[PDB]
C-alpha cells in the first residue's frame, strides 16, 4: 500500500428480525462463531447455522456449553459451504451477512444464490444486510453532452465493487445495489431494501434486503 | 430493455430502445508505448479494425482475433478494398479472447478497453493466462482502459481507511436535442478502474511496468489509461 512504504451484532439481527415478523426454523449461511446466531436465539429463534470452518465451528460450539440449555437446544450447527450447500432440507427464512456475502466473489455468489434457491420453502424469504459505503449510498453525478440530427447523450456511473483497504489487507466492498441486480438475475424478486444504521444509531450505512422466490 | 431515470422522464413527457471507426488516438498510444516493433502483433476482440487499419498504416503486421463470424465477414470485406499491401499483412482469425490458443507466439499482444471490459471475473482470468501463453520472452501485453472520474480521484482516507475504485457500471441515455418518433436509447455496461485491472494482472503473474494517463479524444480530460505488462 502507498501508506506503508511510506511508514456486536445485536442492532444488525434486530432488524433481521424487523423484517421477518418466523414459523419453523431459519438457516443462517456462514454464521461464524454465532455474532448474529447468539442475538437470534435471544429473540427466541430456532436456528440452524452453517459455518464452514472447523475450527471456528470449534469457538461456536464452546460458547454455547456456555449458554443456557434453553439457548443451545435451539441451535443446530451444521458445518458447510455458504456457496454450495445441500441439507435436504427446506426452510420459511434464509439469512446472510453482509461480511460473509462479501467474502464471495461473482461465480460463488451464483452459486449462494442457487443453493438458497433450493432450500426456501414456497412463499419463504430470503435476507441479506449489505454495508454501504459513502459512495454506494450517494446518487450518481449525470454528465451531459450534445452531439451532432442533434442528440443529447446523459452518462452516469454506477457503483457496483469496490476495495476496502487498510493501514495490510484488501477486503471486497459491493454496493447493495449491485447484489439487489444480481438477486434479479438470478430468478429472486427483490422486494424490499431497506437502509438502517449496523450499529443502531447515527448514519445509516447497512442495508437489509428482502428477496423471495415467485 | 434498460429504464434509465431520465429516459422515464422523458418517455412521460413526450420509444425506449436498447442503443446496442475512429480510434485514430488510442492506436497512436498503443504504438508509442510500444516503441519498437520488430515482429507481428497479436489483436485480441479486433471487432472490424477500428484499431486494425490504424496498425496496418504503421507498417505492422497483425494478427487479429476476433468471436463473430459476421464480424470477421465485415473485417474481410474491408480487407479486399484495402491495397494488397496493407491486406497482405493482415492475419484474420475466429478466436475467444477469454481462451483462445493459436501456432504462433508474439512479441506483441494488445486489448482496447471496450472489449476486455465485456468479460467477467473468470473470463479475465482466463484471457491473462491465454496471453502469457502467447508472448514470446521479453513480449509485451498492452492493455488500453477507460477511467471514470471515480476511478482518477484519489480515494477519501478517513488505523487508515480507504475505499479504492474497482468496478462501476457506464449508463447512457441518449435521445434527440429537438423533443416523432423520438427514441431514446439506454444502455449498461461494464466499467472497470484501470488499476483494479493492474492488480489482476499482478494476481495473473505478469509485472506492470508502466500506467500512463491519456485523452481518448486526442485532447480533453485523459479518460484512459494505457498498461504496459510483461511476464517476469
Not at 448474529?36 to 475450527?55: I, K, M, Q, R, Y
Not at 427464512?93 to 438458497?116: K, M, Q
Not at 457496483?160 to 441486480?181: C, G, K, M, N, S
Amino acid at each position: 500500500t502507498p501508506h506503508a512504504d511510506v511508514l456486536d451484532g445485536t442492532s444488525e439481527a434486530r432488524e433481521f428480525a424487523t423484517r421477518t415478523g418466523v414459523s419453523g426454523p431459519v438457516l443462517e449461511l456462514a454464521a461464524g462463531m454465532g455474532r448474529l446466531t447468539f442475538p437470534f436465539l435471544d429473540l427466541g429463534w430456532e436456528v440452524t447455522a452453517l459455518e464452514l470452518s472447523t475450527s471456528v465451528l470449534a469457538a461456536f460450539r464452546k460458547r454455547l456449553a456456555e449458554a443456557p440449555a434453553d439457548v443451545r437446544d435451539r441451535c443446530t450447527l451444521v458445518q458447510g459451504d455458504m456457496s454450495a450447500f445441500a441439507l435436504d432440507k427446506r426452510f420459511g427464512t434464509v439469512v446472510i451477512s453482509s461480511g460473509s456475502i462479501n467474502e464471495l466473489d461473482e461465480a460463488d455468489r451464483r452459486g449462494l444464490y442457487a443453493s438458497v434457491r433450493e432450500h426456501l420453502e414456497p412463499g419463504g424469504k430470503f435476507l441479506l444486510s449489505l454495508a454501504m459505503s459513502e459512495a454506494a449510498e450517494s446518487e450518481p453525478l449525470e454528465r451531459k453532452q450534445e452531439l451532432p440530427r442533434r442528440y443529447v447523450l446523459h452518462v452516469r456511473h454506477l457503483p457496483a465493487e469496490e476495495i476496502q483497504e487498510i493501514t495490510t489487507h484488501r477486503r471486497r466492498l459491493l454496493a447493495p445495489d449491485q447484489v439487489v441486480r444480481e438477486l434479479v438475475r438470478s430468478g429472486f424478486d427483490v422486494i424490499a431494501q431497506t437502509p438502517f444504521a449496523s450499529g443502531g444509531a447515527g448514519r445509516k450505512d447497512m442495508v437489509l434486503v428482502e428477496a423471495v422466490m415467485p
